[PDB]
């Protein structure tokens, strides 16, 4: 069922995952459509910042070997120190906003391993499987 932009924002993370694309589209949006003038360089600046805003994180997903995004798995195990809750305590009983409230503390820390571990090791390995 089509809910609308951010229509699942007020639901559990499990439920919300159903309709990530409805949001995804408008993360970059597009369209929009005497010189200078007020707004003359503001629509300019804003529309630029939108593009940068998008790609800055998209590239990270490019690095984190997935690309086929919205959702993908890794080979990095979850450290229990990063909010030790059960799946039903998390996915079936918590919104994404509530999630960030806690996990945001380890953002860069988790990014470390995502930015690396697998990306490093998945490769070489393959290069070696190509030996024969």
């Amino acid at each position: 069922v089509f809910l609308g932009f951010l229509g699942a924002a007020g639901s559990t993370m499990g439920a919300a995952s159903m309709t990530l694309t409805v949001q995804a589209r408008n993360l970059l949006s597009g369209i929009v459509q005497l010189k200078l003038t007020v707004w003359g360089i503001k629509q300019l600046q804003a529309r630029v910042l939108a593009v940068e805003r998008y790609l800055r994180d998209q590239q990270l997903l490019g690095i984190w070997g997935c690309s086929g995004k919205l959702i993908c798995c890794t080979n990095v195990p979850w450290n229990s120190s990063w909010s030790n809750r059960n799946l039903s305590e998390i996915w079936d009983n918590m919104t994404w906003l509530q999630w960030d409230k806690e996990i945001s503390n380890y953002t860069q820390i988790i990014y470390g391993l995502l930015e690396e571990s697998q990306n490093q090791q998945e490769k070489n390995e393959q290069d070696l499987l190509a030996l024969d």
């Binding site: 007020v38 629509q43 798995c73 195990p77 994404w96 999630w99 391993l113 995502l114």
Partner: protein, 438 residues
């Protein structure tokens, strides 16, 4: 065991400021602006709650400075009135004897430089005594000439407030609470979101708020700090209070070619119903609404206190009286006729005397000034009073309140409190039972 799983398109956001841009339909300053959608979208968000804070909402700051920028840009390509700064030879104007009008204008004459830079021309024009001042018939001076230069507003451009919509760029969301209750800040049980804001007219006024939005339920009292009388109070009405203001002067525009090339619009002759401009207010309506306001006040000060209303502390006319624009003309009205009452412990119509100025200073800004051209013919208009800008004045019962203003960011804030801007963060991660194979 659980693993790190990567998610994208996550419905989360952080409070953040970015560069907003306008939209409005397809006069004032708006043309270079993206047309609005024929179907503005929205969506109520169920289970979503969070805090608002109108007192730190930087949307106001941007809007304020943007409007200022627009103002200047609309004047640069217009005619400068630099050579008007000359000694004026002025005399009283014999209005219908004896003297009810008090003159208020002088039949000034002066040697003016014309298109023929060389031979000058003795001309005349009617000026308000609020615009000119005696030097040292008698000699007079345009008041602006002691502070800065003055520019004539183009006769083609208008000042009619036009509904403007604000939009955020992709990655940013416009959040809008629909909660009829709001203290000025805190959590809202009922939050929605929109593509863009509703049309807001850039109405400049002091003391009284005009042509704004209406409140639901009861009268709304909002203040950064009610107990702190160094702050002020925003009052939003529930029902439009009609005010009808008139300038009964079918006057002409003896335009004078003080070139070269560029033309000046002087004041011709004043004929017709020589009465002072004034405003008409429905008295019973005012009394009724004021009472509703006092009810609120009772609710934040006690069920055994006394409420008195009075005029300002005086001083700068711009703050002392109610200033507003109608059709290009600038009015200054004595709101003592409104703000003069009291309430205990637990037609009819009102006439408000007004004055007309032609030299004005916007947004408390010094260093420049703008000359309003006289508008030909009788000028009369009507608007909706939709709120008050009040200030809080042996402190155990009787309290006195009075009208203020000055800082016009207050006006924008009186509307934008319904909105806030947040930055979406699409990228998130979470623990999920999944080990990824090659």
């Amino acid at each position: 065991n659980l693993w790190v799983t990567v998610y994208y398109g996550v419905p989360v956001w952080k409070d953040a400021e970015t560069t907003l841009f306008c939209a409005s339909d397809a006069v004032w300053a708006t043309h270079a602006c993206v047309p609005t959608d024929p179907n503005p979208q929205e969506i109520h968000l169920e289970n979503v709650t969070e805090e608002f804070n109108m007192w730190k909402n930087n949307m106001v700051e941007q809007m304020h400075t943007d409007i200022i920028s627009l103002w200047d840009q609309s004047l640069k390509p217009c005619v400068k009135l630099t050579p008007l700064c000359v000694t004026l030879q002025c005399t009283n104007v014999t209005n219908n004897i004896t003297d009810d009008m008090r003159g208020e204008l002088k039949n000034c004459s002066f040697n003016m430089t014309t298109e023929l830079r060389d031979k000058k021309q003795k001309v005349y024009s009617l000026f308000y005594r609020l615009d000119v001042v005696q030097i040292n018939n008698k000699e007079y001076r345009l008041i602006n000439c002691n502070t800065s230069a003055i520019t004539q507003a183009c006769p083609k451009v208008s000042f009619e407030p036009i509904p403007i919509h604000y939009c955020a760029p992709a990655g940013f969301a416009i959040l809008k609470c629909k909660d009829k209750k709001f203290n000025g800040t805190g959590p809202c049980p009922s939050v929605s979101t929109v593509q863009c804001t509703h049309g807001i007219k850039p109405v400049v006024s002091t003391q009284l708020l005009l042509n704004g939005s209406l409140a639901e339920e009861e009268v709304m009292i909002r203040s950064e700090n009610i107990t702190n009388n160094a702050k002020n109070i925003l009052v939003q009405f529930n029902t439009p209070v009609q005010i009808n203001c008139t300038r009964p002067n079918n006057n002409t525009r003896k335009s004078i070619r003080i070139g070269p090339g560029q033309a000046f619009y002087a004041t011709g002759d004043i004929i017709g119903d020589i009465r002072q401009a004034h405003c008409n207010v429905s008295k019973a309506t005012w009394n009724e609404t004021l009472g509703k306001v006092v009810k609120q006040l009772r609710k934040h000060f006690g069920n055994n206190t006394i409420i008195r209303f009075a005029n300002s502390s005086g001083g700068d006319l711009e703050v002392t009286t109610h200033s507003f624009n109608c059709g290009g003309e600038f009015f200054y009205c004595n709101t003592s006729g409104l703000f003069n009452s009291t309430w205990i412990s637990n037609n009819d119509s009102i006439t408000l005397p007004c004055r007309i100025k032609q030299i004005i200073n916007m947004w408390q800004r010094i260093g420049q000034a703008m000359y309003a051209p006289p508008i030909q013919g009788v000028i009369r208009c009507v608007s909706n009073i939709t709120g008050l800008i009040l200030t809080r004045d042996t402190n155990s019962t009787t309290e006195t309140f009075r009208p203020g203003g000055g800082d016009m960011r207050d006006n924008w804030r009186s509307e934008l409190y319904k909105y806030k801007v947040v930055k979406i963060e699409p990228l998130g991660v979470a623990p999920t039972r999944c080990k990824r194979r090659v």
